[PDB]
Write a protein that binds this ligand. Structure first.
Ligand SMILES: Cc1ccc(C(F)(F)F)cc1Nc1nc(C(=O)NS(=O)(=O)N2CCCOCC2)co1
Ligand SMILES: Nc1ncnc2c1ncn2[C@@H]1O[C@H](COP(=O)(O)OP(=O)(O)O)[C@@H](O)[C@H]1O
Ligand SMILES: [Mg+2]
Length: 472
């Protein structure tokens, strides 16, 4: 315990906030097993012991916020006090898959001091819980054929071999492991898991959506009026089960209240919501952000060093302006406030009017772990090429380029309609487009409707597309 106390102290300092006190704005999330699940009992059997737990969650659903909340509660003695002597937080986006490294090196880097008692930490592996946050955010490729597997926590291995050996339970077999990932990445992960317990993060319930708006707005009057807009807008109310969406919408309505204009948000698509957020912050640095984003996705870079920023014309003062308006975050290293914003600007890179800009090359890499699957680049590309879309940002886009891309997207649907993209995913893309002329032609390529629904947003998106089928 001599060093455990020093470590828990360091954990309560880093994970005190979400970077805003974590306990202040944290709002209970909904978890379901494989029924409601309780944190303390997460590693209890039914049977063999449960060493691996997998958290499936949508982008922005709150995987990282929940991992940080667990670090904090445990460090405070509220959670797993009797179970684990150590929790180590592994931020997958920082772990190179190429650099040779030892599990000891990895543990030591989670520690505050340079010379920790690593050999003591490892004496009781069953008392360790590894928290891998954002498996999908590993940069580069990653497949089940990796090998050979390592059984020595001191031996240095390529990052991919290291993580594979850890996930397969070859390294420290009886240590516990908690992985958070987006569902799409389970294609790769599933073949390594050993008797996993799968949990699903569902986000905010209707009552928790209200709670968030009230925790966000110090003034109750603002909270209740901001939430009234949501209640009135079927699409936003439904979409606000994603906590990230709650934060985007709340931050936007905040500006309107500072401007004094009567509150009103009429967004109908995710693209509309993300455009409503950026416009509220307002044009000179527009090209720079899209270049950086497109480069980051193509070359697998989430974290951007100052050399990359100056490389794309973003001077140090320009970056300080993004931090002020909460469009950038520093973590030396800079990154986008969320990966979805990096895909949004990457999509816009193909539509700006004066990395390759040939959309056909982009679509060839769709759904590949190596590039990050490109799920939201395509969704945002469908919504941005929408002719009906109008805004100060629409003028920066090229009508000619939008037309060429609109035509290629349609050829793309025709092939896929006759693996990823599923039919439901294409419904999300078509829902972003909205244009009935486009959607009606696209919907005719499908021989049959074949979908599986889980959420209200699934129902809404698929109802919109079914209604736009031809009727004899
Ligand atoms: C940020 C956001 C805004 C608005 C909406 C809403 F409008 F929809 F509410 C949803 C989200 N979040 C989100 N995350 C994923 C996500 O990560 N999906 S995925 O990659 O796992 N996938 C499912 C597995 C099969 O492949 C298809 C792709 C999809 O949507
Ligand atoms: N439980 C929560 N309470 C309050 N805000 C949340 C919560 N979960 C997510 N958020 C919001 O989402 C953002 C980060 O989401 P994140 O945890 O990174 O989701 P993911 O890791 O699944 O993308 C934060 O800025 C925060 O405002
Ligand atoms: Mg995350």
């Amino acid at each position: 315990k001599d060093y455990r106390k020093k470590y828990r102290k360091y954990v309560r300092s880093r994970f005190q906030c979400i970077e805003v006190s974590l306990n202040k704005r944290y709002t209970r999330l909904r978890l379901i097993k494989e029924s409601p699940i309780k944190m303390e009992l997460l590693f209890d059997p039914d049977s063999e012991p449960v060493h691996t737990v997998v958290f499936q969650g949508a982008a922005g659903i709150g995987k990282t916020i929940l991992a940080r909340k667990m670090m904090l509660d445990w460090a405070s003695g509220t959670l797993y006090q009797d179970r684990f002597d150590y929790l180590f937080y592994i931020h997958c986006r920082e772990v190179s898959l190429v650099t040779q490294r030892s599990l000891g090196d990895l543990i030591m880097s989670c520690c505050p001091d340079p010379n920790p008692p690593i050999h003591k930490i490892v004496r009781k592996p069953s008392r360790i819980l590894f928290l891998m946050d954002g498996f999908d955010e590993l940069q580069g490729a990653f497949d089940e054929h990796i090998g050979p597997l390592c059984t020595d926590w001191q031996k240095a291995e390529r990052g991919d071999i290291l993580l594979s050996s850890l996930i397969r339970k070859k390294l420290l077999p009886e240590a516990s492991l908690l992985i958070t990932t987006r569902p799409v990445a389970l294609e790769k992960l599933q073949h390594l898991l050993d008797h996993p317990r799968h949990v699903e993060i569902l986000g905010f319930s209707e009552a928790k959506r209200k709670e968030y708006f009230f925790k966000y707005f110090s003034d109750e009057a603002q909270a209740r009026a901001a939430f009234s807009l949501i209640q009135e807008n079927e699409v936003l109310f439904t979409m606000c089960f994603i906590p990230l969406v709650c934060w985007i919408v709340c931050t936007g309505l905040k500006q309107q209240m500072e401007s004094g204009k009567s509150l009103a948000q009429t967004s109908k698509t995710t693209t509309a919501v993300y455009v409503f957020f950026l416009s509220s912050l307002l044009c000179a640095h527009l090209w720079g952000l899209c270049s950086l984003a497109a480069d980051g996705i193509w070359n697998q870079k989430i974290l951007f060093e100052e050399s990359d920023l100056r490389n794309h014309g973003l001077q140090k003062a320009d970056v300080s302006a993004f931090l002020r308006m909460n469009l950038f975050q520093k973590e030396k290293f800079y990154s986008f406030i969320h990966m979805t914003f990096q895909e949004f600007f990457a999509a816009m890179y193909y539509l700006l009017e004066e990395p390759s800009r040939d959309v056909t090359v982009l679509l060839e890499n769709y759904g590949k772990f190596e590039k990050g699957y490109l799920i939201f680049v395509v969704r945002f590309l469908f919504g941005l090429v929408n002719q009906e879309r109008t805004s100060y940002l629409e003028k920066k886009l090229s009508c000619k380029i939008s037309q060429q891309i609109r035509l290629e997207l349609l050829k793309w649907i025709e092939v896929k309609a006759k693996i990823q993209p599923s039919q439901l995913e294409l419904f999300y893309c078509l829902y972003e487009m909205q244009e009935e002329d486009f959607v009606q032609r696209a919907m005719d390529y499908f021989p049959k409707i074949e979908i599986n629904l889980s959420t209200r947003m699934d129902h809404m998106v698929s109802s919109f597309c079914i209604e736009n089928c031809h009727r004899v």
